[PDB]
Design a protein around this ligand. Structure first.
Ligand code: BEF
Ligand code: BEF
Ligand SMILES: [Mg+2]
Ligand SMILES: [Mg+2]
Lengths: 121, 121
């Protein structure tokens, strides 16, 4: 199972769509509280997290920290157009499996998801 | 005890100089085989690694892999002007403690060195 967290509908749909077409059951969330509620209901096997979450209680990096604190075993991959070297290093040090830069190619998204799912329940 | 690995003398001198002035015993190496020889002789407490090592048998990332294989406990920090998000993510996933972008400020270098030395022998 994959949970995609992004404040933009077009990105949630584009990511869930690409992954669903490859045979992965994908759910979406639009902010930190909808993401945490979706994980607390039934933990997915992988989480894709945006960083700049407009109107969210937590940005994607604080959300990564909260997810990794409750579920250290749950792989989390960042997907963001707001990265730089310092931000990507911070994400990996804080527990993210990988960092996908926006704009991404479909095969890169699938390659990373399947690598992370090999490291999941 | 810090080992600085860079193919450029001006960078080896600039990094060893800044760290020596703060009271850290620093040694230098110019390529993968001089770095591995220095480590095998006596393991340092921290290694600073450049990535593009002109004339070296291994680039800095392959050298990071070799160092982390023999000494998983030895902190390694990348210092490079050849980084990007994918390269920095790769370095942290492969065991680097942190990634310092060139050009760097002296206080950033010292801060990162002292954080990594807190995690060393
Ligand atoms: F809004 Be995300 F960090 F691309
Ligand atoms: F030659 Be290094 F990667 F700045
Ligand atoms: Mg966003
Ligand atoms: Mg170089």
């Amino acid at each position: 199972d994959i949970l995609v967290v992004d404040d933009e509908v077009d990105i949630r749909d584009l990511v869930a769509g690409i992954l669903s077409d490859e045979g992965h059951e994908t759910r979406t969330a639009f902010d930190a509280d909808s993401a945490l509620a979706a994980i607390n209901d039934r933990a997915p096997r992988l989480v894709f997290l945006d960083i700049w979450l407009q109107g969210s209680r937590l940005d994607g990096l604080a959300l990564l920290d909260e997810i990794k604190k409750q579920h250290p075993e749950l792989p989390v991959v960042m997907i963001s157009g707001h990265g730089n070297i310092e931000t990507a290093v911070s994400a990996i040090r804080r527990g993210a499996y990988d960092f996908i830069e926006k704009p991404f190619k479909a095969d890169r998204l699938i390659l990373v998801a399947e690598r992370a799912l090999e490291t999941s329940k």
